């Protein structure tokens, strides 16, 4: 009984035992041998054909003893007389009540406290002549059906033969020699030793002399039919058996190797000899799984709760791993980074450092109200005093109103970073700290620290944008005033006199749509014209390398398109009266404007360049009797603010550009200095000492009852593994 | 000890046996042999000796019977035992038999549990036994033990099958009661060799050693495995009883008290036990006898039915009365007479098909083989012409005659027809010689009686030899008459009928004397050289030249009738230069007229050799075709059907024409006298030699056989037929006695 505790400890910490097959002729006593090897009386036994269907018994180990089937599901038979009745009922259900057979195995599974995980196979007897309603080929049918079970390797064969008939008539011996010629896996059993004729004995058979078998024969005595009808229990049967073997004159010296107990001993011996050569791997596996627990149960081994040393050591190392994990998840130190999400709080936070600019773009880019209000500013800072020059206090007043609305996105950003940071800590305390009252208080302290620092960061952001409403410098990379638009070719490139083709063409560049285009050029397109008070060029792209032809400015005219055309999009044509120099009028050389102010702006650019106005009476003063005091002009079309409005608007857009980029670049730094790094150094150099201050500190870091039961079950598995290794050592000692 | 049923069955079966044997036929009772089968240590030999009743077979634990035993019980007066390999020694104590038989068994097979298929023959002679054969056989096993070869069960099963697979073998399927019935190997064998269960007796042994709490009632009530003959349970001596040497009376007493005291077998105690088994086997033997009797009975009926046909003539027999002798005369004479009628006259029945002869065929062939040696034997030509000439110039030898004289014809035909004397006599002798052989052939089947073949043959042969002289005289006189008168008013042609001779006997008939033509005078092959399309090509045709016309044929069937070509008013020339005529070619033409006819440039006829050319030119000159003289161009008027071939060159007396006339008349008269003799001589010998012999053989023969004596010494044995008679008589009486014995047994 060393494999018994081996197996039960394999069950407590949670073998390929060779199955057992009993073979023999009809009425040899196979089922009695089998159930005496199990230990309990539950198999059909009687005269004539009884076991007419293969039975596959799977003994396994458990804490209580009962039986179950694979067709009577759920029901756990606890009395075995019901098991026997169920067996015979199922057998009569399939095979019928006329001595038929069937190769369809019956599957049992019997649970018992001290058994092996075997597979005992009871098989029908071997018959010669078919009786009842059996088909005429019944011998081959039964023999094939049991050869389908025996010819496998690692199948022990109990060859059961009665002692009434001679040994040379046995069928089990023929089967055993046909499938096992060497006898590596054959145990010979001789039953019915009490019915032999008066004057004979099986002495020459039990001494392994008549037919030599490698492992010899075991003589057993079961219960007779009157003993089965008389309900003779197992104890009295074994007592009578031993009485017989100690009383019989021809067997009195072989009494210590005959009987049922010796048969059970020999089968245990065979099984134990078969499981060794598996002990190396079987031991190595559970040794390897014991290494994974021995590192842990050094701490569970001895307490004795309410000890200061263990609790303080736990506080220290838990705080250590929490701090390490926090700096690891924010700054992203190695190793073993997460590759399924972005991060805990690193990338999700840097995405808000560079999605905040999308919050600055959504607002506002408005409106015509801007133009109207800067006009009112120009008028009001000229309240009673009038005229030149363009005052700059209007600029300082407008840009202090357009950046004033930047307080809203900036503050928003902080809140996002807060809702995203206060979550990262919750992500690194929901899985590390299983101690109750230690994860919640840890979260409380850290989150209060973050809530305290968000106030400082908000005050700093308020101060930051309040600074940009103080000075409003103009020495930055924006252009100096009176430089609209793109003045002046980098200070005229240090040359303006001899340069006929030295960028004297560049004064006002802009897109203008041509309606009529000839066949050789292409189709309708909006070209990039470079207008000068003296010349004009046209480009198709930005490389500034077209320079095909130079279009004039002087002595040129302008007219409108015919009625009915969709001028919105106002299109104006150029012409000449004396000469045909337009040049290359496409019937007609027309240019389109997209808005309404653009038409007047380009008309004024032409009027300052030297182009005559679009008056209806100007045609009679086409190129003869010109400049008659400019009776058509009223001095002027738009005095004198539309140009001032445009100049202030350009200056404001440039200053907004640079202030947007500076807030966009500077606020991430200012929440990284006052919130992130300060939280980090707090979580490093203050979390422990501040954590030692709150609570009664006695009932801090307790169970956590799940941890308690987790500890108990790991400790019991540790003891189970040590016991199993001790048993394997004992079983290799032999 | 028994047995008693056998002592009561032996007398009637012994009487039946010696009745079936003393009747001499290959008839036997063939009592079935008893073969006992089973597995090892099923209790077989005990059952066998319980059937016999004497203790002489080995038995015990383990393997005992290792060689088959063929026990032949033989009925005799002196009881003893003998072996085949111990000839000359008689055993009286059976203990000696058992000891020496186990000595033999372990002497041949060894002492290490070996077997051998060589049986041990044993004969027990006793006044209380039948002539049975009891075959004790080893029990079959499955695994070889000791020194047995690995195929022990196969060779044991062959040892059994060479004994149980023969027909009419009782099989005692012995099975123990300890084992289940479905493990009985004896029943497997019985189902393999006897599927209907006609001859299988099921026996159950070792009933007293069954497991406590069970019983074999479901088996013995013939309920578990249904067997046609049923089961019988026996209880034998145990191993301790044999070691205790228990006698038979106590064993049977224990058997009976066991079957009576058992609570499950008390109502079967009459059909259980060893005596009941003994009774059942004896009943099986008796059933076999009474079941095989009807076949032998109707077989003896069918056999005696054949002998009765001949016994009916042999019902009364009282040697040696003249009644049987006179009946034998009438039988043999009448058989011989109808046989002689069968051989010649060709009356029924059962004419000889295998032999072409026969007397009628040989004989009436020699009637039409004789006319072959009338034409063949005698012959003369080209010399009788001279004799006719001298007769013409001698019978009117003083004065010349102005007529053709007749004595010349008479003397020539008289000199020639007397040459027929020899063939007729030879034919008569040859017919005698073959008929006298037929009469000896038709008395070889008469050899059942000696000294009667000789008398029959002597009488008949002397009769033929007494008649041969008479018929030779008659034939001589018949051919002699033909020389007397020599009439010329017969159907032959009268003188001066053919002029010119002869037109081939007037076209060989009288109907075609006008329809046919005279184109046939000289037949021969002749080659035509130039031939048109319609006639054929260069070819040699068959010309038939006539003194009047010319015919040409391409075959012999004579159905063309193409054209009749002229002879008179014709010419002849030879070919132009350059040709080698050897092989000479001749052309026919005319100068006055252009009648050729149909010249194919040109009409040429070719001949092969030199005699052919000159012979056909001679035929042209004899017919009247103009010669090839130098005046060939001037043949206009000076020729007038030339040829200079009237009778002969140049002048001889008129004896040629008269000799030709005499020759024609002589040949015609010889033809008609040959018709007369060929048709009349066979009639002569059928009337004087055969029909008279037949009348003698049907009428006067019996009186001549009966006249000579003695009547007793004339007919006798020939002891072979007498022995046949006695054998038939023994068969008759023996078969009736056998029918009587069977009739006695049936009731
Ligand atoms: N007297 C006696 N009987 C025994 C002994 N051993 C077994 N038996 C009897 O033999 C009978 C058959 O036993 P069992 O094991 O059921 O045979 P089985 O092999 O199951 C028949 P199958 O399997 O072919 O259906 C039983 O009635 C049993 O009592 C014995 O030692 N002594
Ligand atoms: N108690 C008892 N023993 C029997 C009975 N029948 C046979 N035996 C015992 O069986 C033993 C051998 O029996 P036997 O008849 O010789 O079997 P066998 O077939 O001849 C052995 P072999 O194969 O050599 O022929 C003997 O000891 C005999 O006493 C029986 O009815 N009752
Ligand atoms: Mg069973
Ligand atoms: Mg024997």
Swiss-Prot record, chain A:
Domain PH: 505-611
Modified residues (3'-nitrotyrosine): 111
Record's subcellular location: Cell membrane; Membrane, Clathrin-coated pit; Cytoplasmic vesicle; Presynapse
Catalyzed reactions: GTP + H2O = GDP + phosphate + H(+)
Location of the region described as G3 motif in the Swiss-Prot/TrEMBL record: 122-125
A Pfam family assignment: Dynamin_N
UniProt entry keywords in alphabetical sequence: Cell membrane, Cell projection, Coated pit, Cytoplasmic vesicle, Disease variant, Endocytosis, Epilepsy, GTP-binding, Hydrolase, Membrane, Methylation, Microtubule, Motor protein, Nitration, Nucleotide-binding, Phosphoprotein, Synapse
SMART domains from the UniProt entry: DYNc, GED, PH
Source taxon at top rank: Eukaryota
GO annotation terms (biological process): clathrin coat assembly involved in endocytosis; endocytosis; endosome organization; protein homooligomerization; protein homotetramerization; receptor internalization; receptor-mediated endocytosis; regulation of vesicle size
EC number: 3.6.5.5
Residues at which GDP binds: 27, 29-32, 45-46, 192, 194, 197, 222-223, 225
Predominant subcellular localization, coarse grouping: membrane
Key word GTP-binding present: yes
Cellular component GO terms held in the UniProt record: cell projection; chromaffin granule; clathrin-coated pit; cytoplasm; endocytic vesicle; extracellular exosome; microtubule; plasma membrane
InterPro entries: Dynamin (IPR022812), Dynamin_GTPase (IPR001401), Dynamin_GTPase_CS (IPR019762), Dynamin_N (IPR045063), Dynamin_stalk (IPR000375), G_DYNAMIN_dom (IPR030381), GED (IPR003130), GED_dom (IPR020850)
PTM field: Phosphorylated by CDK5 leading to synaptic vesicle endocytosis (SVE) activation.
Modified residues (Phosphoserine): 292, 333, 498
Tagged with keyword Cytoplasm: no
Effect of residue 316 to R: Significantly decreases receptor-mediated endocytosis
Family: Belongs to the TRAFAC class dynamin-like GTPase superfamily. Dynamin/Fzo/YdjA family.
UniProt domain comment: The dynamin-type G mediates homodimerization and plays a role in self-assembly.
Protein function: Catalyzes the hydrolysis of GTP and utilizes this energy to mediate vesicle scission and participates in many forms of endocytosis, such as clathrin-mediated endocytosis or synaptic vesicle endocytosis as well as rapid endocytosis (RE). Associates to the membrane, through lipid binding, and self-assembles into rings and stacks of interconnected rings through oligomerization to form a helical polymer around the vesicle membrane leading to constriction of invaginated coated pits around their necks.
Subunit organization: Homodimer; homodimerization is mediated by the dynamin-type G domain which promotes assembly-stimulated GTPase activity. Homo-tetramer formed from two dimers in the absence of lipid. Oligomerizes into a helical polymer that self-assembles around the vesicle membrane, when associated to the menbrane through lipid binding.
Protein's recorded name: Dynamin-1
């Amino acid at each position: 009984e060393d494999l018994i505790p081996l197996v039960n400890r394999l069950q407590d910490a949670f073998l390929d035992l060779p199955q057992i097959a009993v073979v023999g002729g009809q009425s040899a006593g196979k089922s009695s041998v089998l159930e005496n090897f199990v230990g309990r009386d539950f198999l059909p036994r009687g005269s004539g054909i009884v076991t007419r269907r293969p039975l596959v018994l799977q003994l396994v180990n458990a804490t209580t003893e009962y039986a179950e089937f694979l067709h009577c599901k759920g029901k756990k038979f606890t009395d075995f007389e019901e098991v026997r009745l169920e067996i015979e009922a199922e057998t009569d259900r399939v095979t019928g009540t006329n001595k038929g057979i069937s190769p369809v195995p019956i599957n049992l599974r019997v649970y018992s406290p001290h058994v092996l995980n075997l597979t005992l196979v009871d098989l029908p007897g071997m018959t010669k002549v078919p009786v009842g309603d059996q088909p005429p080929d019944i011998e081959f049918q039964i023999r094939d059906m049991l050869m389908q079970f025996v010819t496998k390797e690692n199948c022990l064969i109990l060859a059961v033969s009665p002692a009434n008939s001679d040994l040379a008539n046995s069928d089990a011996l023929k089967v055993a020699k046909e499938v096992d010629p060497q006898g590596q896996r054959t145990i010979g059993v001789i039953t019915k030793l009490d019915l032999m004729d008066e004057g004979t004995d099986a002495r020459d058979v039990l001494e392994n002399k008549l037919l030599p078998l490698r492992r010899g024969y075991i003589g057993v005595v079961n219960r007779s039919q009157k003993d089965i009808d008389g309900k003779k229990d197992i104890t009295a049967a074994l007592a009578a058996e031993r009485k017989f073997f100690l009383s019989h004159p021809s067997y009195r010296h072989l009494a210590d190797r005959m009987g049922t107990p010796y048969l059970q001993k020999v089968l245990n011996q065979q099984l134990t000899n078969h499981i060794r050569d598996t002990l190396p791997g079987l031991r190595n596996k559970l040794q390897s799984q014991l290494l994974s627990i021995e590192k842990e149960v050094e701490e569970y081994k001895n307490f004795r709760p309410d000890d200061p040393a263990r609790k303080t050591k736990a506080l220290l190392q838990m705080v250590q791993q929490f701090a390490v994990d926090f700096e690891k998840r924010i700054e992203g130190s190695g190793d073993q980074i997460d590759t399924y999400e972005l991060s805990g709080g690193a990338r999700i936070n840097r995405i808000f450092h560079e999605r905040f600019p999308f919050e600055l773009v959504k607002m506002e880019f408005d409106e015509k109200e801007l133009r109207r209000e800067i006009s009112y500013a120009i008028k009001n800072i000229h309240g009673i005093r009038t005229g030149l020059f363009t005052p700059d206090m209007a600029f300082e007043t407008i840009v202090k109103k357009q950046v004033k609305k930047i307080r809203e996105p900036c503050l928003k950003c902080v809140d996002m970073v807060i809702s995203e940071l206060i979550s990262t800590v919750r992500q690194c305390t929901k899985k590390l700290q299983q101690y109750p009252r230690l994860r919640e208080e840890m979260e409380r302290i850290v989150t209060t620290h973050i809530r305290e620092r968000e106030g400082r960061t908000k005050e700093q952001v308020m101060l930051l944008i309040d600074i940009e409403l103080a000075y409003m410098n103009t020495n930055h990379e924006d252009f100096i005033g009176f430089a609209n638009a793109q003045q002046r070719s980098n200070q005229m490139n240090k040359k303006k006199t001899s340069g006929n083709q030295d960028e004297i063409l560049v004064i006002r560049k802009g897109w203008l749509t041509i309606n009529n285009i000839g066949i050789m050029k292409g189709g309708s397109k909006e070209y990039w014209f470079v207008l000068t008070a003296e010349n004009l060029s046209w480009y198709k792209d930005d490389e500034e390398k077209e320079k095909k032809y130079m279009l004039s400015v002087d002595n040129l005219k302008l007219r409108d398109v015919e009625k009915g055309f969709m001028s919105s999009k106002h299109i104006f044509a150029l012409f000449n009266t004396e000469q045909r120099n337009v040049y290359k009028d496409y019937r007609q050389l027309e240019l389109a404007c997209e808005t309404q102010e653009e038409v007047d702006s380009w008309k004024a650019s032409f009027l300052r360049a030297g182009v005559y106005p679009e008056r209806v009476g100007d045609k009679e003063k086409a190129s003869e009797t010109e400049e008659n005091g400019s009776d058509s002009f009223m001095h002027s079309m738009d005095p004198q603010l539309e140009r001032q409005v445009e100049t202030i608007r350009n200056l404001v857009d440039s200053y907004m550009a640079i202030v947007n980029k500076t807030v966009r670049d500077l606020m991430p730094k200012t929440i990284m200095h006052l919130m992130i790094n300060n939280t980090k150094e707090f979580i490093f150099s203050e979390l422990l000492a501040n954590l030692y201050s709150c609570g009664d500190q006695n009932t801090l870091m307790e169970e956590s009852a799940e941890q308690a039961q987790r500890r108990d079950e790991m400790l019991r598995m540790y003891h189970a593994l040590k016991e199993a290794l001790s048993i394997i050592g004992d079983i290799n000692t032999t």
